[PDB]
Design a protein around this ligand. Sequence first.
Ligand SMILES: Cc1ncc(COP(=O)(O)O)c(/C=N/[C@@H](C=O)C(=O)O)c1O
Ligand SMILES: Cc1ncc(COP(=O)(O)O)c(/C=N/[C@@H](C=O)C(=O)O)c1O
Lengths: 407, 407
Amino acid sequence: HMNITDIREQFPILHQQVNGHDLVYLDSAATSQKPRAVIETLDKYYNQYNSNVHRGVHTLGTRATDGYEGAREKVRKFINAKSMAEIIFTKGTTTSLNMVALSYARANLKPGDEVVITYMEHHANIIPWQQAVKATGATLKYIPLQEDGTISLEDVRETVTSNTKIVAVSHVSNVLGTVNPIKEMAKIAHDNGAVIVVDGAQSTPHMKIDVQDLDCDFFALSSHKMCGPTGVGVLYGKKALLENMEPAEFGGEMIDFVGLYESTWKELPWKFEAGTPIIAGAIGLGAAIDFLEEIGLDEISRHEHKLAAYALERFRQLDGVTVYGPEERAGLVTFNLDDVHPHDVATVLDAEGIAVRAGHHCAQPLMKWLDVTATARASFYLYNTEEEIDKLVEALQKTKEYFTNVF
Amino acid sequence: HMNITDIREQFPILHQQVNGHDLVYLDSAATSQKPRAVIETLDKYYNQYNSNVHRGVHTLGTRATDGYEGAREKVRKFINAKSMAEIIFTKGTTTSLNMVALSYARANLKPGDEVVITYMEHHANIIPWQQAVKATGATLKYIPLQEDGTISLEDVRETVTSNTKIVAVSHVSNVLGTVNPIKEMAKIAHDNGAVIVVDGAQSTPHMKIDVQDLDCDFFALSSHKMCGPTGVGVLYGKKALLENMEPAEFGGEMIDFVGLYESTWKELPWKFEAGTPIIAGAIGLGAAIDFLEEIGLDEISRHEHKLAAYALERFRQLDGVTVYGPEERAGLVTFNLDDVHPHDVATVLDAEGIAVRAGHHCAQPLMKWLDVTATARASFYLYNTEEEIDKLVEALQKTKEYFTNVF
Ligand SMILES: Cc1ncc(COP(=O)(O)O)c(/C=N/[C@@H](C=O)C(=O)O)c1O
Ligand SMILES: Cc1ncc(COP(=O)(O)O)c(/C=N/[C@@H](C=O)C(=O)O)c1O
């Protein structure tokens, strides 16, 4: 099993106080912290072999290249892609999703064509489709949610029709904690001749991903949520789809021949990588993958299952608290105190050393669906403990009392 | 004056051997090395205050935000922009130039409209315009070069007409070393009712930039070329132009309201920053700016003037060597040995510890203009010395002899 003490020892950022209390960092769904192995990877890159990429020029240039392409291979193995040609480094989930919207949607949508999404989608998995449908005169639809905030396959068969070109859905919701039935949704999407686009920002850090088994057409993830550097993400796509898409951006590196007016493109994946790439970040993403793999994604997932069950239980022991979403869930709890604004919850918790987030969580439609204007959220990762969940629930109790007394 | 010994002591990467020789890194135009101050800035971010951005949530979240926005202010002051609203963080020069091509060009070009570029442009400053003209049915033109690879203002007045909508030109060429007359070109562009787009990837690291004085409409730069982290760049644009451009990418952070089908955008600059931003990289870019400013850009520029003059002189002492471009120049020399392929020059130099680059340097049209298929390039920065230029010229001499003897 994973030793949480040994894990925590690897994250320098955890060992500090805020407002005179030990830090309790419960905001990993907004961004995760990094272990020494990742930070030192960046240090070593910049201290030792930084250079632009291109093998066969000079020694540092070769090392930088092998580091960068080596990290591409680590990602390929990590999500079980067939080919490095299917692994594109981007700035993050958002950019990855916009590339599909730009290069895939905008070239394949006619009036009458449908893009189908869901009410629980992050804005990253909403606004690009809004724009693409508007550019092409196509139509945007939403799969409804059940009362507990999961999605039924029946609603999917209903919403998706033989005019659906794209289904775009989150693997795991960053609000509800719902793990969506991606694999069954891809089968439905294909039956109607659609592609499926998976927003995997919240799944990838927390559970094994297998794109062959999921049979997703595209899948997007962010380094910063999975112990990796900021500024880096991945777009996975079926090679046959990427082969037919035009690039989203143009310049050096992604070309083959450049004439005065006309140019040709490199092979995949480089066709989609314009300009000097995110060298250090991608190499650190590779380190983060080595780190998560050595612990075991299955172990991390079990740990989060225990944390989530413990949290849901301790929350149900509190009066005047609503928790949103299903019982089976990823490692997060979005909630509200009756008669306490979530911004205030966050503020008061921070004075107790506790970091949570309050707001829309980039899911305005979902908040509307929940009939709230905002929520608070505690989100967990491999370095969190039950003791920390105790501090959270104890702090929510005191928050209730404190605002009861102000009133 | 700047002490080169004290400067070099700050760059750990310089102090190592390749193939048993002290490293001589002469490839800073491909990418620059980082001082301790920059690396330690990244370390401290990840060790101490990593969190997603948004003030007023939790203490680390506030520190991360102040770090990120504080770096935006450092950039604004660094290039003498009026407003942080004009400073957009991007992945790099390439992405910055594509955003202008996407959001500016594609929305403002009609058949008959001209985009004017030059023969010396990097691909980053070519392919986006190729694509934009093709998307709109507009026309692409090239300002010719003089025999020494500078541009005459007369050719500019000739090429630019009252149908020109955009002039896009490099500040400093990464091949010829030419410093282009940007300020006069902007006056000509405006006289015809065009905007000017400046590719400043090669100028920004090496000389003071003043966007008020240059009167450029847009200006693009890359962190990695100026002692800063990889994966980060800047798009500067006149506020009044950015106000009218639609975003290039969509998602969280860059929105105000999100409805089911329609959304509104945040104010500048956030309108152009979709998704979790490049937090650590931007903060390190700010550190790099603090570092370059403390030394003085003017001092760095003088140092490079001396290095370039010394290099041109020592090169002219070698028989069978052609150097390309003008006498007045930035700190780089692109060249060829008679009867030695530049790839081979690079290879053999690397065995002597010396890092140079060989190839097209992302300037295929310019190579055609030079009537070569490839060149070799030594490029300098604040940490290079004349002793290192001696090793280079001595190594080119031995390369000549060695391939004379092979023959
Ligand atoms: C399901 C899901 N989809 C997209 C994103 C956005 O990813 P990036 O901000 O581009 O790295 C995220 C990350 N969301 C963060 C920040 O917006 C949060 O939940 O606070 C996400 O969880
Ligand atoms: C004048 C000029 N314009 C654009 C670029 C490309 O910037 P990025 O690769 O996107 O950081 C660069 C950087 N060029 C490098 C790499 O392509 C080189 O010259 O080797 C440049 O110098």
